[PDB]
C-alpha cells in the first residue's frame with residue numbers, strides 16, 4: 568500500500584525485444600532503450616485510486632485510475648486503449664489493455680512493491696516481457 572512516492576530506475580531490460588514485436592526500427596529502438604533507461608516514476612496512491620506520473624528526459628505522461636474501473640491510456644506504440652487494473656496479491660497489480668480501434672498484439676502491464684522496497688514494473692506484448700526496477704528516491 569506504500570506505492571506512493573518518488574521512484575528512480577536501477578534496471579531496464581528486454582526493452583528492445585518488446586519494441587521489435589511492433590515494428591520499431593533498430594535506431595528508434597536503440598534511442599528508445601536509452602530513453603527508457605532514464606525513466607522516473609511518481610506515484611500517489613489513496614486506497615484503490617492511483618496517480619502515476621512517468622517521465623523521461625523530454626516526455627512525461629500521467630495516468631489516473633481506480634482499481635476495477637476502466638480508463639483510457641496508450642499502448643507502448645501510442646495506440647489508445649481502454650485498461651482495467653486488478654490486484655493479484657497485496658502488492659502487485661495487473662493491467663489488461665484492449666485496443667479501441669483495430670487489431671494488434673495483446674498488451675498488459677504490472678506493478679509490484681517487493682518486501683525489499685523495490686518497485687517492479689513489467690510490460691508485456693504477446694510472448695515478450697519487459698521489466699523495470701526502481702528504488703525510492
Ligand SMILES: *C/C=C(C)/C=C/C=C(C)/C=C/C1=C(C)CCCC1(C)C
Pocket residue numbers: 599600602603606608619621623642643644645678688699
Ligand atoms: C509505472 C509505469 C512505468 C514505469 C512506465 C514506463 C513506461 C515506459 C518505459 C514507456 C516507454 C516507451 C513507450 C511507451 C513508447 C515511446 C518510447 C518508450 C520506449 C519511452
